């Protein structure tokens with residue numbers, strides 16, 4: 001494991017990580033209070049599969065509950081009331097045992113953190129911030145969903161649970177808990193959620209104070225059409241918007257530009273994600289993914305959230321693309337361990353490592369064929385990747401001598417290495 005910051009000081013931890021999203025939406029309902037025991041038990045496997053890091057669920061306890069007729073949810077971590085670690089995924093002691101086993105197997109533990117809001121109304125919680133002290137967004141006039149005096153980012157729904165993350169006491173609180181996660185729970189980095197809710201610069205401060213040389217990734221899911229008409233972003237590309245956030249927070253960013261193309265464009269169009277950017281400074285900060293607990297399905301209740309899921313017909317193509325390309329890839333728990341894409345992903349992880357593909361490796365796209373044809377310059381080998389393509393052999397598009405590395409999905413997924 002390579003451990004530094006990028007040339008622009010972005011915290012991509014060497015640019016060589018391969019992350020597993022360590023949970024699905026329905027885990028708290030499917031294996032109540034047992035998740036950490038399960039992960040503890042799977043540690044050796046996760047490490048054997050080739051993952052360098054695991055994205056853990058929010059460790060802060062969440063006893064929330066909601067019902068929207070058919071749909072219902074709560075307890076997943078995103079509506080926490082406390083920093084207490086005895087929540088729906090397991091106890092404090094089990095968490096420590098899981099983190100210790102993962103770390104012991106050499107898998108860095110990244111914690112999902114939600115600074116934007118908290119379960120304000122929760123009757124019994126250890127964190128009680130009164131009103132009238134500027135601790136809350138609604139302590140100030142709130143015209144709509146844009147920054148106000150008590151909150152420099154968007155709000156979550158009504159904004160009534162939004163914290164003034166910039167308040168010295170709120171900043172501090174989070175800052176000490178991050179430090180806590182690092183010293184007592186083996187945290188190797190963080191996943192910042194709902195980054196549109198507070199300033200980018202604040203994530204950099206938190207990273208600076210608590211875990212400067214660690215890995216971080218921020219979730220910025222906000223289209224151009226969501227910015228005011230006068231904002232440069234209202235007319236920017238998805239790439240530009242996420243790139244900008246990355247620049248300010250000094251953290252890699254989830255590639256929603258790639259996700260958007262996978263959903264709305266054809267496969268040839270996948271070259272328009274951040275990870276396909278010709279400028280190394282742009283592609284090395286992209287954290288690529290096929291689906292997460294928000295966009296994808298999950299085993300169990302309601303099929304999970306499935307807000308923007310990739311149809312089954314592009315799953316193998318999608319994993320072949322992120323696993324062989326620039327940016328830092330993330331594998332969703334379910335595709336790996338529930339749905340049987342495990343052996344296929346294991347092979348692609350081995351191909352990526354053997355070719356020495358990393359965050360900044362170059363990528364060149366070929367246009368004389370159907371599908372997506374790309375040449376990836378790994379530090380150890382060159383790969384030719386052909387997805388849903390009429391390409392016949394690697395020599396038609398690359399110089400050198402190639403061997404087959406992967407041939408799946410009836411020739412729809414083909415990978416060759418020099």
Ligand SMILES: OC[C@H]1O[C@H](O[C@H]2[C@H](O)[C@@H](O)[C@@H](O[C@H]3[C@H](O)[C@@H](O)[C@@H](O[C@H]4[C@H](O)[C@@H](O)[C@@H](O)O[C@@H]4CO)O[C@@H]3CO)O[C@@H]2CO)[C@H](O)[C@@H](O)[C@@H]1O
Nearest residue numbers: 064065066074078079156157158159160161193194219294
């Ligand atoms: O008091 C604040 C608000 O409280 C009530 O809001 C409810 C929402 O209506 C529910 O839909 C739900 O929200 C979920 C959300 O649906 C779910 O997707 C998840 O979101 C995370 C996301 O997974 C994650 O990746 C991340 O980065 O950010 C998202 C936001 O944290 O979790 C949410 C929280 O459980 O629950 C809330 C709270 O129960 C109320 O209806 C509102 O009117 C009120 O403003």
Ligand SMILES: [Ca+2]
Nearest residue numbers: 001002013014
């Ligand atoms: Ca690394």
Ligand SMILES: [Ca+2]
Nearest residue numbers: 153154155197
């Ligand atoms: Ca906010």
